[PDB]
Paper text:
However, intestinal bacterial GUSs cleave the attached glucuronic acid for use as a carbon source, allowing potentially toxic compounds to re-enter the enterohepatic circulation. However, microflora-encoding β-glucuronidases (GUSs) are notorious for reversing the glucuronidation to release SN-38 in the intestinal lumen and thus represent the major cause of undesirable effects. GUS contains a deep enzyme active site (the two catalytic glutamates lie ~12 Å below the protein surface). To understand the underlying structural basis, we prepared C6-propyl, -hexyl, and -nonyl UIFGs (2–4, respectively) and resolved the eight X-ray crystal structures of 1–4 bound to EcGUS or Bifidobacterium dentium GUS (BdGUS).
Isothermal titration calorimetry was used to measure the thermodynamics of the binding of 1 or 2 to EcGUS and BdGUS. At pH 8.0, the endocyclic amine of inhibitor 2 (pKa = 9.4) was mostly protonated, which afforded a stronger electrostatic interaction with catalytic residues than did 1 (pKa = 8.0). In addition to a small negative enthalpy change (about –2 to –4 kcal mol−1), binding was contributed mainly by entropy (+4.6 kcal mol−1 for BdGUS in Tris buffer; +7.1 and +5.0 kcal mol−1 for EcGUS in Tris and phosphate buffer, respectively). With the aforementioned structural information, the differences between the thermodynamic parameters for 1 and 2 support the idea that the lack of H-bonded water molecules for 2 diminished the coordinated H-bond network, which disfavored binding and thus the observed enthalpy penalty (ΔΔH1–2 = +8.5 kcal mol−1 for BdGUS in Tris buffer; +6.2 and +5.5 kcal mol−1 for EcGUS in Tris and phosphate buffer, respectively). Furthermore, the expulsion of water molecules also correlated with the entropy increase (i.e., –TΔΔS1–2 = −6.2 kcal mol−1 for BdGUS in Tris buffer; –5.6 and –4.6 kcal mol−1 for EcGUS in Tris and phosphate buffer, respectively). Therefore, introduction of an alkyl substituent to C6 of UIFG produced entropy-driven binding. Furthermore, EcGUS contains a narrower aglycone-binding site than LgGUS and BdGUS. The alkyl substituent of the inhibitors therefore facilitated an increase in hydrophobic contacts with nonpolar residues of loops 3 and 5 in EcGUS, e.g., such as Leu361, Phe365 in loop 3, and Val446, Met447, and Phe448 in loop 5.
Author numbering:
A (entry chain B): 1 to 195, 200 to 237, 245 to 366, 369 to 600
B (entry chain A): -2 to 366, 369 to 599
The structure:
Amino acid sequence: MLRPVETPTREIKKLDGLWAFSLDRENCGIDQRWWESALQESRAIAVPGSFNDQFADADIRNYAGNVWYQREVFIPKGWAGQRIVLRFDAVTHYGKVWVNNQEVMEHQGGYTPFEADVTPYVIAGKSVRITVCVNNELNWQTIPPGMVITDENGKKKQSYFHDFFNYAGIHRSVMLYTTPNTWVDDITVVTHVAQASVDWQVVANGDVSVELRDADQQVVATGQGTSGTLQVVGEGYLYELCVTAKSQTECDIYPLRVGIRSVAVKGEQFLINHKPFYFTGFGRHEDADLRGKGFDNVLMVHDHALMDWIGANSYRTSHYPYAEEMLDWADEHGIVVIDETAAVGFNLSLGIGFENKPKELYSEEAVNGETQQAHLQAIKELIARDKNHPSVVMWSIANEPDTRPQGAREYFAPLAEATRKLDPTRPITCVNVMFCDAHTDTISDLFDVLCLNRYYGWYVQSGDLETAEKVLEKELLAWQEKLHQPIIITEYGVDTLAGLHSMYTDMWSEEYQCAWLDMYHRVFDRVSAVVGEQVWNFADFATSQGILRVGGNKKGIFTRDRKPKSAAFLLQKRWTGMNFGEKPQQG
Amino acid sequence: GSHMLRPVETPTREIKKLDGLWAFSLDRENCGIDQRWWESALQESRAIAVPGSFNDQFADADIRNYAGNVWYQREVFIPKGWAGQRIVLRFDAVTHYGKVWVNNQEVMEHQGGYTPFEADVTPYVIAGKSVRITVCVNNELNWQTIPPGMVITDENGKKKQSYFHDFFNYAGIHRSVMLYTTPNTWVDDITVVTHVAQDCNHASVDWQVVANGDVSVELRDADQQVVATGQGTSGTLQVVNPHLWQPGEGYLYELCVTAKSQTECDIYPLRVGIRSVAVKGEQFLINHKPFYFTGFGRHEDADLRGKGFDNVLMVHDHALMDWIGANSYRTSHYPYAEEMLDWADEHGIVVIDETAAVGFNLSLGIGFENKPKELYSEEAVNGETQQAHLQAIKELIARDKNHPSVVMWSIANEPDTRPQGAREYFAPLAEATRKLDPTRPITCVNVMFCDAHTDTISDLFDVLCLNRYYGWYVQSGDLETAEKVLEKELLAWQEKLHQPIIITEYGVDTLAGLHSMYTDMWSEEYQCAWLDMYHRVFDRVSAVVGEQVWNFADFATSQGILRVGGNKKGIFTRDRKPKSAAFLLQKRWTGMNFGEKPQQ
Ligand SMILES: CCC[C@@H]1NC[C@@H](O)[C@H](O)[C@H]1C(=O)O
Ligand SMILES: CCC[C@@H]1NC[C@@H](O)[C@H](O)[C@H]1C(=O)O
């Protein structure tokens, strides 16, 4: 499965915004089969957006259970001789959908599309009732995991183990799509460099021809057959190889953009086209002021303008798969992307407070075999749909897992190996949490380049930069000599509320963010193996409520409404001072 | 105005073209028209989101303050199952000036920044292939624009736009772009008007221009059960025993007009609410019952889209207004996105509909630095200006005529009526508006300094709308003098005109977080105290039938020593968080009985 693009392939975008929405507090929907009649006592909701914060209501915001969307649609008239298929680009956590009293789809996965042919349940020209049942619950076999808890009164409350807030709803595009009656499924392409080759595979209903055209889209070379190899002689050139499906009586044309993408890892260097690289940029989040994680074109354009100004050339889709629009953008603009799945919270050592969670991390009570297989499904879907993007430069299996407990490597080994089985073109990482240090972590052996999320001077060095530097440097050198891999610091940052200034350079002040980030920068400058720096969050984002979070995680370089803290000008001076992709040497 | 109805979905349809990502480029030296950029793909472009203002999408002050022409562009595949159908391309709002090319054929031109414009473009496309849409957008204001302004060119030829309204002059394609298909039998326009007597029964006269054929109509129920039927291009009266459109509820029948040609059919559903507005003495009646307006002057303004319409923003802002107890609002200083008038229609929100005629006043800006000396004059507000204004009223009424939520038209906001020729200007505009729609009252929002003994034009309008700021811009910080001045000025207006009085703006700048024990200006405590005193005075004047505090949220403005990052008069911050006064109003507005004036 890959993204619908239009040519003699058509669609009616159904991000019509306003659907009928209703909560299901007493779980009556399935039994009264609500999809059967117009929702009783509904309210208007926006459909590219989370349902949590759109109504300024704490009881919808913290709601756990089943919610219901509904929307009627007229199917276009020129589709009577076509297959009508219905695609949701992201339903966060779980979705099941009924096209007029007949059930059509079901899917467990919050950041990946799922589609299904409904041509035998539609006829072009008339109006059908679409009803969606969305679930936002997490158990130990979900990606990410969690524990629902039902109190004395029967009220559900969801507990989880990741920082960001558990936003849910229809966060991305809904889509009615038609394609000619022979070509259905997937295409895959792989690219090589010689210090200039390709490959093709199409799955459709008949003969296939493929022609690579360039940005002027004049044909630069053509083959036809499911496989073989053509050759050819800040932001990146994207050719376009146009694959055609000659068969039955109708032809089908699909355009797939390809970039000359190359890379594996070599010793201590993350090369690109046989070129050393330094990652600069951010751990991101899909989080905005009123839409939750809902995608929005304005926000995307503005935050790319911000990363462009600040000099970042890369980022990482922190803790879940992102809106594909962003990877198409990264394609055209030459942004380097670390693709991560929703597998966060595999750790019960991070929660901090005054408050019964399972005692053995890897076991049947928690992360079991079912968990490992749901995980492998998540990696499967992320690779299945982002495989042809040039901007995806590395896969990341999970984020900050607890690898101290027994059973950790028995769990993660088949996943690393299987993912290498899923695509050998790009490297494999697993971002490492602070407390599984160099002397302790179990799984770093299995990955190509190890990524570190370290916060010396914040969570563990009590605001004392002068010792934090020393600790961070030992640990740096230790990691490299233990694995002689490239080191990408994927998370590093401190909570700072915009407006707090202090002569004493204290924690939470803007001066402290500046000083802390630049001391980290000084040690980066001095160790061979660090090939990347991505600060911990570009903007402030929302989290669940707790004594550690003042209205959200304030570790951002920008505020939630995208206004710059002082450190935004620190980074801008450093990241645009170096030349592109090259690390500042030691002074 | 020219015939136009909202594109609604029947067995003939529309395909959304706000795909957001278009090619955008500014035209710094007007090379665009000369090289007719409309001919080839835009040279040196960057991605823009549509709909949204272009000013703040790139976090760059040099685009933000840019004056001149900008260029949007996008290819489109026209669906082929549309062959033998009329294809129309509608822009719902291109702010200030826009003209567009279907690759090389130019199709439309428009100077109104907040009202739609379309053109039948069936002979310039054929279904199945993809054509390039190129749009030229101008953000310049002169004295014949609505609103007016003065572009001024420095020594170097760079433009800088000067204007005389508070809010910032956002531009771009702010609303929906859209290709839509209709059968070759045209239902070009519909007009519906409602009457009632004692809530028991009456009728909805009707008129329709349907360019191509016979028309029958059926008014259907919320159950879509037929409750009456008509026949004819006009007349089309039927009588009912209905459940009529009321503020708290908003019951909407559906007028299904069908246009039978000899081979083609066309179906249009137009939602109607059975409401009757009028004014009698000092009372604003709705279904023959006095009404009390509560709520806000609003704005189309958010943190990164400028004035771009956004569904989440609409849903969340209605959630807040509903919580806070607001029952009404007015589309402050320009026509709003029709989505909002449909929302108000379905939910029973009462709306004062206003045109973009702000800044007809050179007495409001205050500072230390060349504006014309005669407001009404050939160099400034001129005859061309008056026809431009009459055109703006023509489009707004043409587009929001059948909405039950629209309860009153407002021609302009805070014009200076002191100079002679103010009444010469506004009188024919008031009379013309009255003939363009006799169903709803006519207002013209009154500025603080054209007081009751000074104003010239209020004679000409049905309901008096006051923007008062005693205690803020004058009597600054003194609640005891502001109360007296306000109360005698209110009583004065009542003695002079015996109209209903709606206080359509009253508010103070309040920094969220700034608290004070001394109840001084800019603190949240001052907002509460100030609004609260104003509320005692309203409660003590017979003729005041409405209160709309000045601004629901903080919004952006031009830069100046009076605007701290914008106008801070909102009850909510720009990111919709409530100041302390937000709970003051919530206590009042849900304490009173719905639609009733507090009895003191
Ligand atoms: C010491 C663990 C740090 C933690 N790392 C994972 C991110 O998802 C969180 O945002 C970050 C944080 O605490 O902000
Ligand atoms: C005395 C004029 C007040 C003025 N009235 C018009 C609004 O558009 C402005 O926002 C408001 C203000 O200055 O706050």
